[PDB]
Amino acid sequence: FKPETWTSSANEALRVSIVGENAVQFSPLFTYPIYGDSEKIYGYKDLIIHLAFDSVTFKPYVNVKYSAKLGDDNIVDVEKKLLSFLPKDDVIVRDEAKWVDCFAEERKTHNLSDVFEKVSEYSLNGEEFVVYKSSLVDDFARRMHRRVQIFSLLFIEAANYIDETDPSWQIYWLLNKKTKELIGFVTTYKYWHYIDKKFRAKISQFLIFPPYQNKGHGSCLYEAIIQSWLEDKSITEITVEDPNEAFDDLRDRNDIQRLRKLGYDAVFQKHSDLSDEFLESSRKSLKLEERQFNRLVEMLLLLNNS
Numbered sequence: 001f002k003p004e005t006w007t008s009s010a011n012e013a014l015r016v017s018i019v020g021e022n023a024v025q026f027s028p029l030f031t032y033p034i035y036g037d038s039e040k041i042y043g044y045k046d047l048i049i050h051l052a053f054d055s056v057t058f059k060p061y062v063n064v065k066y067s068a069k070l071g072d073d074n075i076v077d078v079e080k081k082l083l084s085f086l087p088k089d090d091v092i093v094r095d096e097a098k099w100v101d102c103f104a105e106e107r108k109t110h111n112l113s114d115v116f117e118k119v120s121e122y123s124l125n126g127e128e129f130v131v132y133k134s135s136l137v138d139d140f141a142r143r144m145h146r147r148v149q150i151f152s153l154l155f156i157e158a159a160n161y162i163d164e165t166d167p168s169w170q171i172y173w174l175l176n177k178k179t180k181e182l183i184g185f186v187t188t189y190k191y192w193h194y195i196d197k198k199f200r201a202k203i204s205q206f207l208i209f210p211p212y213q214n215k216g217h218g219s220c221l222y223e224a225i226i227q228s229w230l231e232d233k234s235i236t237e238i239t240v241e242d243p244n245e246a247f248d249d250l251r252d253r254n255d256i257q258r259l260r261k262l263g264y265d266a267v268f269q270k271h272s273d274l275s276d277e278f279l280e281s282s283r284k285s286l287k288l289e290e291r292q293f294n295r296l297v298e299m300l301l302l303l304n305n306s
Protein backbone atom coordinates (compact mmCIF):
# COMPACT_ATOMS: atom_id res chain seq x y z
CA PHE A 1 0.00 0.00 0.00
CA LYS A 2 2.25 2.81 1.33
CA PRO A 3 0.18 5.90 2.31
CA GLU A 4 2.97 8.33 1.25
CA THR A 5 1.92 7.79 -2.35
CA TRP A 6 -1.37 9.46 -1.31
CA THR A 7 0.24 12.18 0.83
CA SER A 8 1.89 15.27 -0.61
CA SER A 9 3.29 18.57 0.62
CA ALA A 10 0.85 21.37 -0.25
CA ASN A 11 3.84 23.68 -0.72
CA GLU A 12 5.28 21.46 -3.44
CA ALA A 13 1.91 20.59 -5.02
CA LEU A 14 0.76 24.20 -5.44
CA ARG A 15 2.61 25.81 -8.35
CA VAL A 16 1.91 29.50 -8.85
CA SER A 17 2.94 31.40 -11.98
CA ILE A 18 2.56 34.93 -13.32
CA VAL A 19 2.11 34.89 -17.10
CA GLY A 20 3.17 37.72 -19.41
CA GLU A 21 5.95 37.35 -21.99
CA ASN A 22 6.14 33.86 -20.50
CA ALA A 23 5.05 31.98 -17.39
CA VAL A 24 7.45 32.31 -14.48
CA GLN A 25 6.57 29.54 -12.01
CA PHE A 26 7.30 29.46 -8.26
CA SER A 27 6.20 27.80 -5.00
CA PRO A 28 4.28 29.31 -2.08
CA LEU A 29 6.05 29.94 1.23
CA PHE A 30 2.84 29.17 3.14
CA THR A 31 -0.20 26.97 2.37
CA TYR A 32 -1.56 26.35 5.87
CA PRO A 33 -4.24 29.04 5.57
CA ILE A 34 -5.77 26.91 2.76
CA TYR A 35 -4.71 23.30 3.27
CA GLY A 36 -4.43 23.18 7.06
CA ASP A 37 -1.68 23.51 9.69
CA SER A 38 0.21 20.42 8.52
CA GLU A 39 0.46 21.85 4.98
CA LYS A 40 -0.08 18.31 3.69
CA ILE A 41 -2.74 17.00 1.32
CA TYR A 42 -3.98 13.39 1.70
CA GLY A 43 -5.83 11.30 -0.87
CA TYR A 44 -4.27 12.18 -4.24
CA LYS A 45 -1.50 10.60 -6.30
CA ASP A 46 0.72 12.67 -8.64
CA LEU A 47 -1.09 15.80 -7.41
CA ILE A 48 -0.36 19.10 -9.17
CA ILE A 49 -2.28 22.30 -8.54
CA HIS A 50 -1.66 25.09 -11.07
CA LEU A 51 -2.52 28.65 -10.06
CA ALA A 52 -1.74 31.26 -12.69
CA PHE A 53 -2.29 34.97 -13.07
CA ASP A 54 -2.08 37.24 -16.08
CA SER A 55 0.93 39.52 -15.47
CA VAL A 56 -1.21 42.61 -16.16
CA THR A 57 -4.80 41.99 -14.99
CA PHE A 58 -4.07 39.08 -12.64
CA LYS A 59 -6.98 37.07 -13.99
CA PRO A 60 -6.80 33.76 -12.05
CA TYR A 61 -6.59 30.34 -13.66
CA VAL A 62 -6.82 27.07 -11.75
CA ASN A 63 -6.09 23.48 -12.78
CA VAL A 64 -5.89 20.47 -10.50
CA LYS A 65 -4.38 17.28 -11.91
CA TYR A 66 -3.81 13.84 -10.41
CA SER A 67 -3.29 10.27 -11.58
CA ALA A 68 -5.56 8.73 -8.94
CA LYS A 69 -7.57 9.70 -5.84
CA LEU A 70 -8.88 7.98 -2.69
CA GLY A 71 -12.54 7.08 -2.31
CA ASP A 72 -12.75 8.00 1.39
CA ASP A 73 -15.53 10.38 2.46
CA ASN A 74 -13.48 13.08 4.12
CA ILE A 75 -10.95 13.45 1.32
CA VAL A 76 -10.52 17.21 0.97
CA ASP A 77 -11.67 18.77 -2.31
CA VAL A 78 -8.37 20.31 -3.39
CA GLU A 79 -9.93 22.49 -6.08
CA LYS A 80 -12.90 23.76 -4.06
CA LYS A 81 -10.54 24.68 -1.22
CA LEU A 82 -8.31 26.81 -3.43
CA LEU A 83 -11.30 28.50 -5.08
CA SER A 84 -12.75 29.50 -1.67
CA PHE A 85 -9.86 31.95 -1.27
CA LEU A 86 -9.99 33.23 -4.86
CA PRO A 87 -12.54 35.81 -6.14
CA LYS A 88 -16.01 34.25 -6.52
CA ASP A 89 -16.89 33.60 -10.19
CA ASP A 90 -13.77 35.31 -11.52
CA VAL A 91 -11.59 32.23 -11.91
CA ILE A 92 -11.28 30.22 -15.13
CA VAL A 93 -10.87 26.53 -14.33
CA ARG A 94 -9.26 23.95 -16.66
CA ASP A 95 -10.08 25.79 -19.90
CA GLU A 96 -6.73 27.45 -20.56
CA ALA A 97 -7.82 28.91 -23.89
CA LYS A 98 -10.89 30.51 -22.28
CA TRP A 99 -8.60 32.11 -19.70
CA VAL A 100 -6.27 33.62 -22.30
CA ASP A 101 -9.22 35.00 -24.27
CA CYS A 102 -10.68 36.57 -21.13
CA PHE A 103 -7.51 38.41 -20.12
CA ALA A 104 -6.32 39.36 -23.62
CA GLU A 105 -9.77 40.94 -23.99
CA GLU A 106 -9.76 42.62 -20.58
CA ARG A 107 -6.23 43.95 -21.25
CA LYS A 108 -7.85 46.37 -23.69
CA THR A 109 -9.80 48.55 -21.20
CA HIS A 110 -7.46 47.79 -18.26
CA ASN A 111 -6.02 51.17 -17.32
CA LEU A 112 -5.04 52.22 -13.79
CA SER A 113 -4.03 55.68 -14.99
CA ASP A 114 -7.68 56.68 -15.52
CA VAL A 115 -8.94 55.75 -12.05
CA PHE A 116 -5.93 55.75 -9.67
CA GLU A 117 -3.88 58.68 -8.37
CA LYS A 118 -0.20 58.59 -9.26
CA VAL A 119 2.08 58.78 -6.24
CA SER A 120 5.58 58.54 -7.72
CA GLU A 121 7.87 57.16 -10.45
CA TYR A 122 11.36 55.66 -10.56
CA SER A 123 13.72 53.76 -12.83
CA LEU A 124 15.66 50.28 -12.07
CA ASN A 125 17.72 48.87 -15.09
CA GLY A 126 16.44 51.32 -17.69
CA GLU A 127 12.74 50.67 -17.08
CA GLU A 128 10.29 53.17 -15.61
CA PHE A 129 7.92 52.17 -12.79
CA VAL A 130 4.82 53.88 -11.43
CA VAL A 131 3.23 53.91 -8.00
CA TYR A 132 -0.50 54.56 -7.84
CA LYS A 133 -2.92 54.48 -4.94
CA SER A 134 -6.62 53.98 -4.49
CA SER A 135 -9.30 53.08 -2.01
CA LEU A 136 -11.30 49.87 -2.18
CA VAL A 137 -14.67 51.49 -2.79
CA ASP A 138 -14.68 51.37 -6.59
CA ASP A 139 -15.33 48.13 -8.50
CA PHE A 140 -12.02 48.15 -10.37
CA ALA A 141 -9.77 48.31 -7.29
CA ARG A 142 -11.91 45.76 -5.45
CA ARG A 143 -11.63 43.40 -8.39
CA MET A 144 -7.84 43.67 -8.58
CA HIS A 145 -7.46 43.35 -4.81
CA ARG A 146 -9.46 40.11 -4.61
CA ARG A 147 -7.20 38.73 -7.37
CA VAL A 148 -3.81 39.56 -5.75
CA GLN A 149 -5.05 39.09 -2.16
CA ILE A 150 -4.15 35.37 -2.01
CA PHE A 151 -0.45 36.27 -2.35
CA SER A 152 -0.44 37.65 1.20
CA LEU A 153 -1.59 34.27 2.55
CA LEU A 154 0.92 32.37 0.43
CA PHE A 155 3.93 34.55 1.24
CA ILE A 156 3.27 36.50 4.43
CA GLU A 157 3.02 34.38 7.55
CA ALA A 158 0.11 35.18 9.88
CA ALA A 159 -1.63 37.29 7.19
CA ASN A 160 -5.43 37.46 7.00
CA TYR A 161 -7.80 38.90 4.40
CA ILE A 162 -8.78 42.50 5.20
CA ASP A 163 -12.39 43.74 5.25
CA GLU A 164 -12.78 45.51 1.90
CA THR A 165 -15.70 47.66 3.13
CA ASP A 166 -13.57 49.45 5.75
CA PRO A 167 -13.06 52.97 4.27
CA SER A 168 -9.73 53.36 6.08
CA TRP A 169 -8.05 51.01 3.60
CA GLN A 170 -5.90 52.43 0.83
CA ILE A 171 -3.83 50.30 -1.54
CA TYR A 172 -0.65 51.28 -3.38
CA TRP A 173 -0.02 49.57 -6.69
CA LEU A 174 3.40 49.26 -8.28
CA LEU A 175 3.44 48.65 -12.02
CA ASN A 176 5.76 48.70 -15.00
CA LYS A 177 5.02 51.99 -16.75
CA LYS A 178 5.19 50.79 -20.35
CA THR A 179 3.84 47.24 -19.94
CA LYS A 180 1.32 47.92 -17.12
CA GLU A 181 2.24 44.66 -15.38
CA LEU A 182 1.55 44.62 -11.65
CA ILE A 183 4.86 44.27 -9.77
CA GLY A 184 3.56 44.49 -6.22
CA PHE A 185 1.01 46.03 -3.88
CA VAL A 186 0.64 47.49 -0.37
CA THR A 187 -2.42 47.67 1.86
CA THR A 188 -2.22 50.68 4.22
CA TYR A 189 -4.48 51.99 6.98
CA LYS A 190 -5.34 55.59 7.96
CA TYR A 191 -6.59 55.67 11.53
CA TRP A 192 -6.81 58.10 14.40
CA HIS A 193 -7.99 57.96 18.02
CA TYR A 194 -8.04 61.54 19.42
CA ILE A 195 -11.03 72.27 9.98
CA ASP A 196 -9.07 69.20 8.78
CA LYS A 197 -8.05 66.00 10.61
CA LYS A 198 -4.85 64.16 11.56
CA PHE A 199 -4.12 60.43 11.14
CA ARG A 200 -1.51 57.74 11.77
CA ALA A 201 -0.63 55.76 8.67
CA LYS A 202 0.39 52.13 8.94
CA ILE A 203 1.65 49.60 6.44
CA SER A 204 -0.29 46.38 6.96
CA GLN A 205 0.68 44.17 3.97
CA PHE A 206 3.62 44.81 1.64
CA LEU A 207 4.27 42.43 -1.27
CA ILE A 208 6.41 42.30 -4.40
CA PHE A 209 5.51 39.21 -6.47
CA PRO A 210 8.33 36.56 -6.39
CA PRO A 211 9.47 37.03 -10.04
CA TYR A 212 10.31 40.68 -9.31
CA GLN A 213 12.02 40.44 -5.91
CA ASN A 214 15.69 41.17 -5.14
CA LYS A 215 15.84 43.91 -7.78
CA GLY A 216 15.32 47.01 -5.64
CA HIS A 217 11.52 47.34 -5.91
CA GLY A 218 10.54 46.89 -2.28
CA SER A 219 13.04 49.57 -1.32
CA CYS A 220 11.84 52.00 -3.98
CA LEU A 221 8.19 51.23 -3.26
CA TYR A 222 8.74 51.68 0.49
CA GLU A 223 10.63 54.93 0.01
CA ALA A 224 7.93 56.20 -2.35
CA ILE A 225 5.15 55.61 0.20
CA ILE A 226 7.14 57.03 3.13
CA GLN A 227 8.25 60.11 1.22
CA SER A 228 4.61 60.55 0.20
CA TRP A 229 3.36 60.32 3.77
CA LEU A 230 6.06 62.67 5.00
CA GLU A 231 4.80 65.32 2.55
CA ASP A 232 1.17 64.86 3.64
CA LYS A 233 0.69 67.32 6.52
CA SER A 234 -2.37 65.44 7.81
CA ILE A 235 -0.24 62.35 8.63
CA THR A 236 1.05 62.44 12.21
CA GLU A 237 2.95 59.16 12.58
CA ILE A 238 4.06 56.29 10.35
CA THR A 239 4.13 52.77 11.73
CA VAL A 240 4.45 49.18 10.51
CA GLU A 241 1.97 46.46 11.45
CA ASP A 242 3.71 43.26 12.64
CA PRO A 243 6.72 43.18 10.26
CA ASN A 244 8.69 39.99 9.64
CA GLU A 245 12.45 39.45 9.53
CA ALA A 246 12.71 40.35 5.82
CA PHE A 247 10.61 43.49 6.08
CA ASP A 248 12.36 44.62 9.27
CA ASP A 249 15.67 44.46 7.40
CA LEU A 250 14.21 46.46 4.50
CA ARG A 251 12.51 49.00 6.77
CA ASP A 252 15.83 49.56 8.62
CA ARG A 253 18.02 49.86 5.53
CA ASN A 254 15.85 52.55 3.95
CA ASP A 255 15.20 54.36 7.23
CA ILE A 256 18.92 54.57 8.03
CA GLN A 257 19.74 55.92 4.56
CA ARG A 258 16.98 58.55 4.78
CA LEU A 259 18.17 59.84 8.15
CA ARG A 260 21.79 60.00 6.95
CA LYS A 261 20.96 62.03 3.82
CA LEU A 262 19.28 64.49 6.19
CA GLY A 263 22.53 64.78 8.15
CA TYR A 264 21.33 62.94 11.27
CA ASP A 265 24.52 60.92 10.92
CA ALA A 266 26.43 63.85 12.43
CA VAL A 267 23.68 64.84 14.91
CA PHE A 268 24.06 61.44 16.61
CA GLN A 269 27.83 62.00 16.64
CA LYS A 270 27.57 64.77 19.28
CA HIS A 271 29.36 63.41 22.39
CA SER A 272 26.84 64.74 24.96
CA ASP A 273 23.67 62.91 23.88
CA LEU A 274 20.77 65.31 23.23
CA SER A 275 17.75 66.93 24.91
CA ASP A 276 14.54 64.94 25.32
CA GLU A 277 12.54 67.75 23.72
CA PHE A 278 15.04 67.63 20.86
CA LEU A 279 14.68 63.87 20.38
CA GLU A 280 10.91 64.38 20.45
CA SER A 281 10.93 67.24 17.94
CA SER A 282 13.14 65.28 15.53
CA ARG A 283 11.13 62.06 15.95
CA LYS A 284 8.05 64.06 15.00
CA SER A 285 9.91 65.60 12.03
CA LEU A 286 10.81 62.16 10.76
CA LYS A 287 7.25 60.87 11.49
CA LEU A 288 8.72 57.58 12.73
CA GLU A 289 7.17 55.61 15.57
CA GLU A 290 9.07 55.89 18.88
CA ARG A 291 10.14 52.20 18.99
CA GLN A 292 11.54 52.44 15.48
CA PHE A 293 13.14 55.86 16.06
CA ASN A 294 14.99 54.62 19.17
CA ARG A 295 16.15 51.56 17.24
CA LEU A 296 17.47 53.84 14.51
CA VAL A 297 19.21 56.04 17.08
CA GLU A 298 20.88 52.91 18.50
CA MET A 299 22.06 51.79 15.05
CA LEU A 300 23.42 55.24 14.27
CA LEU A 301 25.38 55.26 17.53
CA LEU A 302 27.51 52.13 17.16
CA LEU A 303 27.87 53.03 13.47
CA ASN A 304 29.98 56.09 14.31
CA ASN A 305 30.96 55.10 17.87
CA SER A 306 34.05 57.31 18.30
Ligand SMILES: CC(=O)SCCNC(=O)CCNC(=O)[C@H](O)C(C)(C)COP(=O)(O)OP(=O)(O)OC[C@H]1O[C@@H](n2cnc3c(N)ncnc32)[C@H](O)[C@@H]1OP(=O)(O)O
Pocket residue numbers: 155156203204205206207208209212213214215216217218219240241242243244246247249250253
Ligand atom coordinates in the same frame (compact mmCIF):
# COMPACT_ATOMS: atom_id res chain seq x y z
C1 LIG B 1 4.35 44.68 7.22
C2 LIG B 1 4.70 43.99 6.19
O1 LIG B 1 3.91 43.70 5.35
S1 LIG B 1 5.65 42.51 6.52
C3 LIG B 1 5.46 41.43 5.03
C4 LIG B 1 6.63 41.54 4.07
N1 LIG B 1 6.24 40.78 2.82
C5 LIG B 1 6.65 39.58 2.52
O2 LIG B 1 7.46 38.89 3.25
C6 LIG B 1 6.10 39.08 1.20
C7 LIG B 1 7.12 38.23 0.48
N2 LIG B 1 8.26 39.06 0.12
C8 LIG B 1 8.20 40.19 -0.56
O3 LIG B 1 7.05 40.75 -1.00
C9 LIG B 1 9.55 40.88 -0.82
O4 LIG B 1 10.61 39.88 -0.82
C10 LIG B 1 9.83 42.00 0.25
C11 LIG B 1 8.73 43.06 0.31
C12 LIG B 1 10.04 41.30 1.63
C13 LIG B 1 11.08 42.85 -0.18
O5 LIG B 1 10.88 43.36 -1.50
P1 LIG B 1 12.08 43.27 -2.60
O6 LIG B 1 11.60 43.87 -3.90
O7 LIG B 1 12.57 41.88 -2.84
O8 LIG B 1 13.24 44.19 -1.85
P2 LIG B 1 14.69 44.45 -2.31
O9 LIG B 1 14.72 44.50 -3.80
O10 LIG B 1 15.28 45.59 -1.54
O11 LIG B 1 15.20 42.94 -1.81
C14 LIG B 1 16.53 42.37 -2.03
C15 LIG B 1 17.54 42.62 -0.97
O12 LIG B 1 18.68 42.70 -1.89
C16 LIG B 1 19.27 44.00 -1.94
N3 LIG B 1 19.21 44.35 -3.40
C17 LIG B 1 18.77 45.54 -3.98
N4 LIG B 1 18.79 45.51 -5.34
C18 LIG B 1 19.25 44.27 -5.64
C19 LIG B 1 19.50 43.61 -6.94
N5 LIG B 1 19.29 44.20 -8.07
N6 LIG B 1 19.98 42.32 -6.86
C20 LIG B 1 20.19 41.72 -5.63
N7 LIG B 1 19.99 42.25 -4.42
C21 LIG B 1 19.53 43.50 -4.48
C22 LIG B 1 18.35 44.89 -1.11
O13 LIG B 1 19.17 45.76 -0.36
C23 LIG B 1 17.47 43.96 -0.22
O14 LIG B 1 17.81 43.94 1.17
P3 LIG B 1 18.84 42.68 1.79
O15 LIG B 1 20.18 42.65 0.95
O16 LIG B 1 19.07 42.87 3.35
O17 LIG B 1 18.06 41.30 1.67
Ligand SMILES: [Ca+2]
Pocket residue numbers: 241242
Ligand atom coordinates in the same frame (compact mmCIF):
# COMPACT_ATOMS: atom_id res chain seq x y z
CA1 LIG C 1 -0.37 43.19 16.10
